[PDB]
Each structure stands twice: as structure tokens, then as C-alpha cells.
């Protein structure tokens, strides 16, 4: 239900926090930029305004992408179908 | 039906208008560039020829991506299967 | 069958040719670069080593993305399940 | 089963090795950077911190994308549903 969505939501934020912590400390980004970069990476947008410069960070980025894309897109999907779609249908009821 | 497609179409344009308004005013882009950037972002292409420079804009971009990807890809999917696919089948009928 | 795959294949190449023609003439790219850019765009990789510089090209790029992503990913999907998957299963048979 | 996952895993690494070999030798990247670039490309992130500079490499990149995206996203999907999802459910059992 909503708890399915809530758990995915929590997993997704924890995953984004891990990236924030990693890119803040290993790659020297401000926490806000490391969060923003983590999001841009796992949603596969990839502006490239930020990207890892160290070998450690490139290796982490490889694993982070493979492990986090599946979760992040699972969350977007549940966001879309269990939250945005009901809300839309609700907003379409005429009164 | 077609109204399902029409509603998604309207929601998608309204979402792209929101990004146009936000990136035009907060990030200083020409309206055309803010529209183009919004599209490039939510379809996950992400050239990076444009990207947010302010902290406010990076935070908005985080939320805009998570909220808009699901809708935009729902629309592309309905575009593909309820409009392009029938039109293709129609264009394959021999006479 | 295979003709389903063949038609999608033809549609996809015709779509990539349209982008090649457009970006070669309107954006001044070498045909090879315009083809490469069209592919990078519709598969949503978006390196940004190329991106449209004119207003005409940005507008075309908006429409090209929305119209071409659905087809290109339909083709990759049929490539994956009707061609690569059988070939893999075939290559797994022990003799 | 797990062997389905194991085979996809092997195919995916072999595909990433092919890109590593190609971009290391034809494009002159360090092996680590060619591996990192191959991953960033086939998951469709596409930072553009690296991108092919030679005509040979752009042509290979076209084919590599079309052939490798389907496999890489098949693997992420099986990673997500046959490995991460069971592990999550397991980690949710109360004791
Ligand atoms: K991308
Ligand atoms: K980029
Ligand atoms: K992408
Ligand atoms: K990109």
C-alpha cells in the first residue's frame, strides 16, 4: 500500500544520503552539490556539471549506478502509479 | 481513449511550462532555453549545455526530476502505443 | 515476427536519417557527427559533446526527442527480446 | 533462477570488458576510464566528461549503445527484482 511507497521512499533517501556522504568527503563537493549530483546520476540525466575526478570515486560511481538505478526507478514508478495517478483522478472528478 | 492521451498531453505541457517559468526567472534563461532545458532534463537526455547554477535551482531541479520523469515517460509511452503505433499500422495497409 | 523487428528497424533508421539531415544542414554538423548526435540524443545518453546552438534546432530537438524516444526504445526492446535473447539461448545449448 | 541472474551478470561484464578494450586502445583512455566511460554510456547517464573523438570510435559507440543498452537494463532489472527485492524483504522481517 502506502507503506510499500513509504519504504521505497525511505530506501531512496538513504541511497541518496550515501551518495551525498561519499561525494562530499571523497570528491570534495558541498553536501548540496553531492546530493544534487547523486540525484542527477541515478535518474540517468547526467548533466556532467559534476563528475568524479578520482579513481576511487569513479569506481564507486560504477557500483552506485548499478545498485541505485533499479531502486530509484522503482520509486519513480510507485510515485507515478500509487500517488500521482490517484491524485490526478481525484483532481478530475467534476463537482 | 484519446482523452486519456489528451489529459497526459495537457499535464505534460503544464509541467514543461512550470519549468519554463522557474528556470526563466530564477536561473535567468531565455524562455526558449528554459523550455528546451526542461525537456532535456525530464526526458533524461541531460546534455548539460544548461544546468542550474544557484542553490535554489538545484533543489528545485531535484524535485522537478522526481515529479516530472514519471509523467513525461507516461506520456511518451501513451504517445508511442495509442498514437504512433495505430498510425504506423494504418500506414502499412496495402492498397 | 522478424518482420515486426524489420519494420521497427527501418523506422528507426529513417528516424536517425531525418536527424542526420536536419542537424547536418541546420546545425552545420558533419553527417557522421549529426548521425552520432541523433543516436546519443534519442537513446537519452546525451554527452553534450554536441548540442543545438540555434533556436530552430532547439525547437526541432524538443519535438525530435518526444517523437523518437518511443520508437528507439521500442526497437531496443524488440532487439533485446526477439533477437539477442534467442541468440543467447542458442549459444547456451551444450553439445 | 540465480543462474539466470549469473548469466546476465557475466554477459554484462563481458560487454563492459569489450568497451574497456575498445576505448582503451582506439580512444587512448586509461583502462579504468574506459570501463567507467562504458558504464556511464550503457546506463544512459552520459556525463560527457569522456566521449569518443575519432570517427571509428563514434561509429563503434553508435553500435555499442544499441547492442548494450538492452542487456545492461535487463541486468539492472534482474538485479532489482531477483536480488535486491528479496534481500529487502528479508531485511524487513521482524524478530
Ligand atoms: K543522460
Ligand atoms: K552531459
Ligand atoms: K538517460
Ligand atoms: K547526459
Residue numbers in the entry:
A (entry chain A), B (entry chain A), C (entry chain A), D (entry chain A): 20 to 114
What wording appears in the published article?
Potassium ion (K+) channels are highly selective membrane protein pores and operate with near diffusion limited efficacy. Their high selectivity and flow rates allow them to function as critical elements in electrically excitable cells, such as neurons, muscle cells, and endocrine cells, facilitating the use of electricity in biological organisms.
The correlation between the atomic displacement parameters (ADPs) and the occupancy of an atom coupled with the inability to distinguish between electron density of a K+ ion and that of a water molecule make anomalous diffraction studies necessary. To fully understand the characteristics of K+ movement in a single file through the channel, we have experimentally determined the number of K+ ions within a selectivity filter, using anomalous X-ray diffraction. Despite the long wavelength of λ = 3.35 Å the data was of high quality allowing the crystallographic phase problem to be solved by K-SAD. Using the SAD data directly, we were able to refine the occupancy of the four K+ ions within the ion channel in each of two protein molecules (subunit A and subunit B) present in the crystallographic asymmetric unit, with the phenix.refine program. Each K+ ion within the selectivity filter is shared between four unit cells and thus has a maximum occupancy value of 0.25. After refinement, the occupancy values for all the K+ ions in the channel clustered around 0.25, suggesting that all four K+ binding sites in the NaK2K selectivity filter are fully occupied with K+ ions.
